[PDB]
Design a binder for this molecule. Structure first.
Ligand SMILES: O=C1c2ccccc2C(=O)N1C[C@@H]1c2ccccc2CCN1C(=O)[C@@H]1CCCC[C@@H]1c1nnn[nH]1
Ligand SMILES: O=C1c2ccccc2C(=O)N1C[C@@H]1c2ccccc2CCN1C(=O)[C@@H]1CCCC[C@@H]1c1nnn[nH]1
Ligand SMILES: O=C1c2ccccc2C(=O)N1C[C@@H]1c2ccccc2CCN1C(=O)[C@@H]1CCCC[C@@H]1c1nnn[nH]1
Lengths: 286, 286, 286
């Protein structure tokens, strides 16, 4: 239906909200964020777009965000929701049973292993069991009612490790680590596999993509992206992964590539209006 | 039966070969290595002690070693054997079916994922399938005729990841990662479980100890060591782990702690003649 | 007109500046470099010879160079220019529109993919687009106002890959890879074709030479050199390639071969005053 892209960074933190339509390839110019921010994460619950966490990198100063803002598509306006317990810059998020999980992120020099859950019915955040590892630039994916924290950065080492959360048991456990170390990678779920595209391994931006099969418990490489990129927006729409923007250790990308799992190929389908990195993206449900 | 300690580091790379008898608590001052080195690994095959890889850190310069030297307890003599294909400083080693596996390590700035095997009868090294990850300061453990590479450092990031080698199939496979990131940890096998004691997580030296059960595929913490230590010697003697020396953030340890798995307790049983880190340790077989 | 040879290595890093006249076959002994260096690159802009990057391998210690020095033929004198942003040993250089491009190279352990441009009239360096691959011992050629980075070493593997820079667009594209892997090869342009002579493939020094046709996008072998050589000086003078010195496996070459494209034959036309490798070579324009 539509692929949102909220915020991002180019010279400073951005306030752009734009929506891409895969059918005709048009870009909608929607209402801008109240506060500019990069390193945020986007998710859609009910029929509202949620902008979680982030950081406002401006010439005047840098401020980490604990703000949850809710975009109503009908009115084309943003409405503040209950803020998180702590600011979370470079955050990952996943949705289970209509509840938003705010995973990891940073507050200045404090790297979070803590995770908290938002209940939209109550407008209320509540902390859950923390991760085994501190993760910023973490990628999150939801599969079989289980949340996966994939890769990231613990303040010293970038991570190839991943861990699975069990909502019913309220506990974390380590799974098989990735083949490549990835911080700020695009993580999503397509069919019955966890995907991890792009990222930063400590010295190079990555174009390699690998997927995790839950039953075999093995990470397998697939066709790499055309442009290597970190801090990229990722989204699945009608059986195909879409990756939007990012940073290639150099230029802020406007490129948007699409992955077809049947053919195992990447192809640039469009461009964003301007180059940016660290965007929060989410698809309109259904 | 003796616990050998070869080489090590204190202000410069050491040449010490010393042997500890756990029965009476005595120390034997044996013949020194012909070339001093730290970051080496020790192993015992067919009644002979082998010193593998390492580096000679001296005031006159630094040289990485590809040397395999063989110590005969009967003659108290070091005799050179066939050198490895490439130098391997901060190496890990394991023994399967009388063959010595040289795993990972570094040569100057090259970090090895490559692995090679030594055949004592032929005095020959041959490369096998390389690891999925480049690892230096890697811990090696042999269990059920499979070789496990644990933790380490890839040149940028310290690792909690672990992978298992299959000699018959000649292939590596990533297993469940550790709870803690460990580079230069003491890795050994006790009662059908892989132990990972100490190490360096990128910031602090560790005193925590976790073990891996092969069937459950889970890492579990046990009682921590009294002293934090990285680049530590390790071996098993009559159902108990012996850790020797290491680096705790400033002092080079001479302490030697012993782990009793029944009581789940650590106790300092003896001291080495001088403090050191990066030693090659192996026990006399049987 | 003269073929300059600056620096080089034999036992230690050299300070020689010598100039060969192809007409009468004489050698000119010009003013030595202020600082000895090998792994540098030479180029001529506006009647001035430039010595870029390199390293001073001395008995007292090894130091990588970020220095740009300018030789004035009128005064027979070297003058320091603005240094590069980072030291670059085994550097490659080319010139587009009177601007010197510093491509890749190493700073001790760091292998650069970054590229920076020097403006002689301003005496300023500015970073441009970094390469898709990190390359040390990289050969550079300019053709149709596009800069080509060929072969080299990425810190792990020696490369047969090549890539093309687009100054106006400020981006890099990966072109067709070479038939042979070449690190430290002599790269130049002749009759609208990119040549890659000699180099090191990981095991042996090479005498084979292959050229790239830009329209057909194919690498084709030509007559090989008489001597195998890596880290060789190279240039083009009156429709013929001149390769100077290098390393063949044990002996530092003083040989200077010349390639005639019409006959497709190499021939030793002269010798340098002493054998050396890793020199910077360039021709007085016109
Ligand atoms: O885009 C860049 C970038 C540009 C230039 C230099 C360094 C970086 C970088 O690390 N990135 C990625 C990084 C990143 C990584 C993972 C997830 C989100 C993001 C947001 C973008 N980003 C950034 O680093 C932001 C953009 C670059 C300025 C610094 C910004 C920042 N500083 N502290 N937090 N953010
Ligand atoms: O003992 C120290 C130490 C002391 C003081 C400062 C830093 C270190 C350190 O990293 N180590 C551990 C490190 C290490 C880690 C894993 C496995 C083997 C070893 C050998 C000892 N060691 C070292 O780093 C060596 C001892 C310290 C000087 C540098 C030496 C080295 N440098 N490159 N290779 N060796
Ligand atoms: O000439 C030799 C040589 C001689 C003996 C052993 C190894 C080499 C080698 O790699 N080379 C080539 C190498 C090279 C490769 C590409 C581009 C420039 C150069 C300069 C010369 N050179 C060298 O390696 C230099 C000469 C050999 C000593 C080491 C020198 C060095 N070390 N780190 N940087 N330079």
């Amino acid at each position: 239906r539509l692929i949102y892209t909220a915020g991002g960074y180019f010279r400073q933190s951005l306030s752009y909200l734009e929506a891409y339509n895969p059918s005709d390839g048009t870009w909608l110019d929607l209402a801008d964020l109240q506060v500019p921010r990069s390193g945020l994460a986007g998710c859609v619950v009910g029929g509202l777009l949620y902008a979680v966490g982030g950081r406002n990198n401006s010439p005047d100063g840098n401020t980490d965000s604990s703000a949850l803002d809710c975009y109503n598509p009908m009115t084309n306006q943003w409405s503040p929701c209950a803020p998180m317990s702590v600011p979370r810059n470079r955050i990952g998020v996943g949705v289970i049973d209509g509840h938003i999980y705010a995973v990891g992120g940073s507050h200045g020099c404090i790297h979070h292993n803590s995770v908290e859950r938002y209940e939209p019915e109550r407008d209320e955040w509540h902390l859950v069991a923390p991760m085994l590892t501190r993760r910023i630039g973490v990628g999150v994916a939801v599969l079989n009612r289980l949340l996966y924290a994939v890769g990231g950065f613990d303040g010293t080492n970038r991570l190839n490790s991943a861990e699975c959360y069990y909502p019913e048991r309220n506990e974390w456990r380590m799974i098989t680590a990735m083949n490549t170390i990835r911080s700020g990678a695009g993580v999503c779920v397509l069919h019955n596999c966890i995907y991890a595209a792009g990222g930063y391994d400590g010295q190079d931006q990555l174009n390699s993509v690998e997927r995790y099969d839950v039953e075999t418990e093995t990470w397998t490489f697939v066709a790499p992206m055309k442009h290597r990129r970190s801090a990229l927006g990722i989204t699945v729409h009608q059986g195909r992964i879409y990756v939007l923007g990012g940073y290639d250790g150099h230029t802020f990308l406007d490129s948007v590539e699409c992955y077809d799992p049947d053919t195992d190929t990447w192809s640039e389908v469009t461009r964003m209006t301007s180059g940016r990195s660290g965007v929060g993206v989410a698809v309109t449900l259904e």
